[PDB]
Enzyme design. Structure first.
Site, PDB file in Angstrom:
ATOM      1  N   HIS A   1      26.773  11.358 -33.434  1.00  0.00           N
ATOM      2  CA  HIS A   1      28.068  10.801 -32.926  1.00  0.00           C
ATOM      3  C   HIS A   1      29.179  10.961 -33.959  1.00  0.00           C
ATOM      4  CE1 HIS A   1      25.738   9.048 -29.670  1.00  0.00           C
ATOM      5  NE2 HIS A   1      24.934   8.484 -30.556  1.00  0.00           N
TER       6      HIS A   1
ATOM      7  N   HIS B   1      32.592   6.252 -41.957  1.00  0.00           N
ATOM      8  CA  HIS B   1      32.572   7.431 -41.069  1.00  0.00           C
ATOM      9  C   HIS B   1      33.975   7.640 -40.506  1.00  0.00           C
ATOM     10  CE1 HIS B   1      32.081   3.915 -38.525  1.00  0.00           C
ATOM     11  NE2 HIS B   1      32.824   4.624 -37.662  1.00  0.00           N
TER      12      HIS B   1
ATOM     13  N   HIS C   1      36.388   9.147 -36.959  1.00  0.00           N
ATOM     14  CA  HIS C   1      36.521   9.639 -35.593  1.00  0.00           C
ATOM     15  C   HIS C   1      37.659  10.607 -35.583  1.00  0.00           C
ATOM     16  CE1 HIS C   1      34.130   6.105 -34.159  1.00  0.00           C
ATOM     17  NE2 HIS C   1      34.646   5.559 -35.262  1.00  0.00           N
TER      18      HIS C   1
ATOM     19  N   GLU D   1      41.184   6.080 -33.021  1.00  0.00           N
ATOM     20  CA  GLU D   1      40.761   5.083 -32.034  1.00  0.00           C
ATOM     21  C   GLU D   1      41.847   4.035 -31.872  1.00  0.00           C
ATOM     22  OE1 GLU D   1      36.677   3.941 -33.234  1.00  0.00           O
ATOM     23  OE2 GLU D   1      36.237   5.295 -31.561  1.00  0.00           O
TER      24      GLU D   1
ATOM     25  N   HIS E   1      36.740   4.671 -40.928  1.00  0.00           N
ATOM     26  CA  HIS E   1      36.231   3.299 -40.843  1.00  0.00           C
ATOM     27  C   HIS E   1      35.273   3.081 -41.961  1.00  0.00           C
ATOM     28  CE1 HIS E   1      36.973   3.302 -36.245  1.00  0.00           C
ATOM     29  NE2 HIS E   1      38.060   3.017 -36.961  1.00  0.00           N
TER      30      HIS E   1
ATOM     31  N   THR F   1      33.177   0.011 -32.047  1.00  0.00           N
ATOM     32  CA  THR F   1      33.763   0.937 -31.055  1.00  0.00           C
ATOM     33  C   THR F   1      32.783   1.892 -30.481  1.00  0.00           C
ATOM     34  OG1 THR F   1      34.428   2.637 -32.687  1.00  0.00           O
ATOM     35  CG2 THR F   1      36.002   0.769 -32.304  1.00  0.00           C
TER      36      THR F   1
HETATM   37  N1  LIG Z   1      33.213   2.502 -35.223  1.00  0.00           N
HETATM   38  S1  LIG Z   1      32.966   1.092 -35.864  1.00  0.00           S
HETATM   39  O1  LIG Z   1      33.408   1.114 -37.266  1.00  0.00           O
HETATM   40  O2  LIG Z   1      33.464   0.059 -35.045  1.00  0.00           O
HETATM   41  C1  LIG Z   1      31.265   0.847 -35.904  1.00  0.00           C
HETATM   42  C2  LIG Z   1      30.410   0.599 -37.035  1.00  0.00           C
HETATM   43  C3  LIG Z   1      29.111   0.503 -36.485  1.00  0.00           C
HETATM   44  C4  LIG Z   1      29.180   0.641 -35.103  1.00  0.00           C
HETATM   45  O3  LIG Z   1      30.551   0.840 -34.737  1.00  0.00           O
HETATM   46 ZN   LIG Z   2      34.089   3.889 -36.281  1.00  0.00          ZN
END
Ligand SMILES: NS(=O)(=O)c1ccco1
Ligand SMILES: [Zn+2]
Ligand SMILES: NS(=O)(=O)c1ccco1
Length: 257
Positions: free
Chosen positions: A61, A91, A93, A103, A116, A195
């Site tokens: 992902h 990570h 997006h 996002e 993030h 998210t």
């Molecule tokens: N994308 S996020 O940072 O909200 C996240 C971390 C783990 C799962 O979703």
């Molecule tokens: Zn994220």
């Protein structure tokens, strides 16, 4: 089986993860004129001097740069937070083109990508417990815009060729995530969710106002990764962002006047 295609993308997730239609889902559009300055919020404390990066993983992902979170080495405190939150991974997006990928949005503007930095509240003892609590996680969100290269991102970009497909990992020690931050720590904050599935409502979101600049060549290398496993039909890992969700009964607070 969830993902970011037509057949298993964000509009489908509610069928397996009904909290997708909940009251504190993320991400959201940040309306800059409506967000109220909260002179009661503190400066964030981002304390990464002792960060121990370990490994980078393509999870199908996104890719995660993982840290040693078995002690208080890289922590987030202050801001809207009570207590101490340990960095577990970061990570991104991103999009198929520079006009989408983030996002969160700002007055409906989409950035080319969003980083993030995921932290969990030590009062819950481990990550799997923390995601079950409304104050379990704090995610620091930083927008990426395309312009000048970000020098502290290049070590991440250069290893991606080694983790092209789902389930591949590589050693990734000695990486300093302070090279991914912008100059300013001004932020917005609101209560939200993960998210990605399971979409749990356990996140205090802290989204920095100042984007970092990355080069087109840097984000082009993100878009060479694959969602699929080795030798499977190639599905480029692009557009792995969930769109903005309804804000509902929530207030976005600004740390800055
Ligand atoms: N994308 S996020 O940072 O909200 C996240 C971390 C783990 C799962 O979703
Ligand atoms: Zn994220
Ligand atoms: N809800 S979901 O996104 O995991 C899914 C599986 C098959 C279609 O949609």
């Amino acid at each position: 089986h969830w993902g970011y295609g037509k057949h298993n993308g964000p509009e489908h997730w509610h069928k397996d993860f009904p909290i997708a239609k909940g009251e504190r889902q993320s991400p959201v559009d940040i309306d800059t004129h409506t967000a109220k300055y909260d002179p009661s919020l503190k400066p964030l404390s981002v304390s990464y001097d002792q960060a121990t990066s370990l490994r980078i993983l393509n999870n199908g992902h996104a890719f995660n740069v993982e840290f040693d979170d078995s002690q208080d080495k890289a922590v987030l405190k202050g801001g809207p937070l009570d207590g101490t939150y340990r960095l577990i991974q970061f990570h991104f997006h991103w999009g198929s083109l520079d006009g989408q990928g983030s996002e969160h949005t700002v007055d409906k503007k989409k950035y080319a990508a969003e980083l993030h930095l995921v932290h969990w509240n030590t009062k819950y003892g481990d990550f799997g417990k923390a995601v079950q609590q409304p104050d379990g996680l704090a995610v620091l969100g930083i927008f990426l815009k395309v312009g000048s290269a970000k020098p502290g991102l290049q070590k991440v970009v250069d290893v991606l060729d080694s983790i092209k497909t789902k389930g591949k990992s590589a050693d990734f020690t000695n990486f300093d995530p302070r090279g991914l931050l912008p100059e300013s720590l001004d932020y917005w904050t609101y209560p939200g969710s993960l998210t990605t599935p399971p979409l749990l409502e356990c996140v205090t979101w802290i989204v920095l106002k100042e984007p970092i600049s990355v080069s087109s060549e840097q984000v082009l290398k993100f878009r060479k990764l694959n969602f699929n496993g080795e030798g499977e039909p190639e599905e480029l890992m692009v557009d792995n962002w969930r769109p903005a969700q309804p804000l509902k009964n929530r207030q976005i607070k600004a740390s800055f006047k």
